[PDB]
């Protein structure tokens, strides 16, 4: 490949914390950045600091009342803000902190600029881990997400590409993104997620899309604790079929750390290389890529995961030994660069997976 990889990072993303016990900390972005920098990778990517987005750009997908409420709400002014809090689901699940507007603007600006750079051809690989809030849908904060900048990325890519493909690998289904393109045939959303009594709850197998988006939405229902050898086996053939058949011009991938082995909320049994297998397979097709970072609440794991992936995209394999980052204490007893899977029993039987393959491929048989 030897792709020209651009990169985006704002130094203000590690200075906005959620609630004390809240599992969502963007500090993981910052030690992931330090993992990237101390490995000497800074000589291989084009580092940028994208401009934060403005209200006129969030109103492209979100609503004027929603954005206006976002720009004015504050922990100090909360007590008089009662109707909007319940109306837009901005209460406890998605709490309000000091720099919420700033963080949302940073994430949206970074992802929207990444899509812009992919459009102009400055890079064929744009990476923005700050974005990836695949749960909020145009009017409400959901799943700790407040702004679905991903849809802005696909909007900008569609400005140049006739077809854009979205892949979700977060153990959470890409509800907001699939909803944003449930009816259009330009975008395919393909979410690999856990299906059951899980927080998304959506992503049913028979969710091929409505309207013109019929047969243009793929949902992969999975059981607990899938491992690398099974995740790759369920991943690769479907991606092969979609690329061979839907044939997107652009493609967007959501790289969430939630499916990591031993995630604070995750339940999957993916190690480092099982996760990197999907990235390698995606980069194996040549079409431009816009990598974001979604789930993951074990920052010592997601930082290592993201550093390994950014090494992999530049077609290099990083060292297994740490370069003595600043936050050295975070990286366990051995201080290596890997995620060790646990001994739990994987319940994803081959027969259920085979039926899933049969259904998905039969549905795709009509997407030349």
């Amino acid at each position: 490949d030897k792709r020209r990889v651009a990169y985006f990072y704002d130094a203000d993303v590690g200075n906005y914390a959620y609630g004390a016990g809240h599992p969502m900390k963007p500090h993981r972005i910052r030690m992931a950045h330090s993992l990237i920098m101390n490995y000497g990778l800074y000589k291989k990517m084009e580092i940028y600091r994208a401009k934060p987005a403005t209200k006129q750009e969030m109103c492209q997908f979100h609503t004027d009342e929603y954005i206006d409420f976002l720009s004015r709400v504050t922990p100090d002014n909360l007590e008089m803000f009662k109707r909007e809090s319940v109306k837009f689901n901005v209460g406890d699940d998605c709490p309000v902190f000091d720099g919420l507007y700033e963080y949302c603007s940073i994430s949206g600006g970074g992802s929207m600029e990444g899509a812009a750079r992919l459009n102009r051809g400055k890079c064929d690989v744009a990476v923005n881990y700050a974005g990836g809030l695949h749960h909020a849908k145009k009017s409400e904060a959901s799943g700790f997400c407040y702004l679905n900048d991903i849809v802005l990325g696909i909007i900008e890519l569609l400005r140049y590409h006739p077809r854009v493909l979205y892949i979700d690998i977060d153990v959470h289904h890409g509800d907001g993104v699939e909803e944003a393109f449930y009816t259009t045939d330009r975008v395919m959303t393909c979410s690999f997620h856990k299906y059951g009594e899980f927080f998304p709850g959506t992503g049913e197998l028979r969710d091929i899309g409505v309207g013109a988006g019929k047969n243009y939405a793929v949902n992969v229902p999975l059981r607990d604790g899938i491992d690398d050898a099974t995740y790759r086996s369920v991943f690769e053939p479907v991606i092969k079929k979609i690329m061979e058949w839907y044939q997107p011009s652009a493609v967007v991938l959501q790289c969430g750390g939630d499916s990591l082995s031993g995630d604070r909320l995750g339940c999957f049994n993916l190690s480092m290389e099982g996760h990197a297998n999907c990235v390698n397979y995606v980069k194996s097709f040549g079409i431009p890529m816009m990598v974001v970072g979604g789930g993951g609440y074990t920052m010592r794991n997601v930082a290592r995961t993201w550093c390994f992936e950014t090494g992999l995209l530049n077609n290099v394999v990083l060292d297994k030994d740490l370069p003595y980052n600043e936050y050295y204490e975070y990286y366990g007893p051995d201080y290596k660069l890997s995620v060790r899977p646990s001994n739990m029993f994987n319940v994803n039987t081959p027969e259920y997976l085979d039926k899933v393959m049969t259904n998905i491929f039969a549905n795709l048989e009509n997407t030349k």
């Binding site: 009662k82 299906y195 039987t349 259920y352 899933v356 259904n359």
Partner: protein, 264 residues
Amino acid sequence: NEDFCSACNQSGSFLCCDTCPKSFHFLCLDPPIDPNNLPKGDWHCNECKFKIFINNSMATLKKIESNFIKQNNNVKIFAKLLFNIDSHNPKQFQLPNYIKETFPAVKTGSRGQYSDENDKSYNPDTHIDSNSGKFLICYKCNQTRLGSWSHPENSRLIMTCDYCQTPWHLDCVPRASFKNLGSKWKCPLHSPTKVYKKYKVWKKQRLINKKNQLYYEPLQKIGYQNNGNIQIINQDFKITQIDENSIKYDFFDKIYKSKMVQKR
């Protein structure tokens, strides 16, 4: 004061009163008041307003008599009700405790919601009946697929449908997880009870008390157009006793007609 709305009987935003210790939701109020523009003053319930402005222990008869005589020439059957409903606090609408009892298949939820008959490591014991000592032979796979404790990676999960208790593999019918929190799972060996045909909608009648159930049996026994309300062996919910062989007959000539529509 109260932790429930005096109309919805639910917690939440409360516009409580001072004359009468009552608690109301802002929406559960007539007219619905916007909490943004607070009245900012003494708010009394409709009953409090009537008890203060009108309720002179004897003069109330004078008021009701006056209202009646301003409506006796006009509609007067409703005059008493029209007068009296002005003395009452708004309340959430509920069914009158007997329409529900007309159907012995419905129950009221916690706050008053609808509820019906479908509301609801290595575990090898899940394959055991435990009352007959037998295994759970799934209908689709005709096995239990217990695997072994030594090799747990061969066992197959079973849900044992919540209606007719038929055991089923998670792999025999595609399913990711068990049904534990939501509705009761039902295996696909049950009637649809609802049909969309091209559109047109069909629904099966509800469960009524057998006191009011009027069972009926036809006489032609070959051709008798009935709904899905059949029995295999106010006069509107009659359930046909179908005489099972009539089902076979009706199916047969129906297939014959489906043949001759395209054959001639």
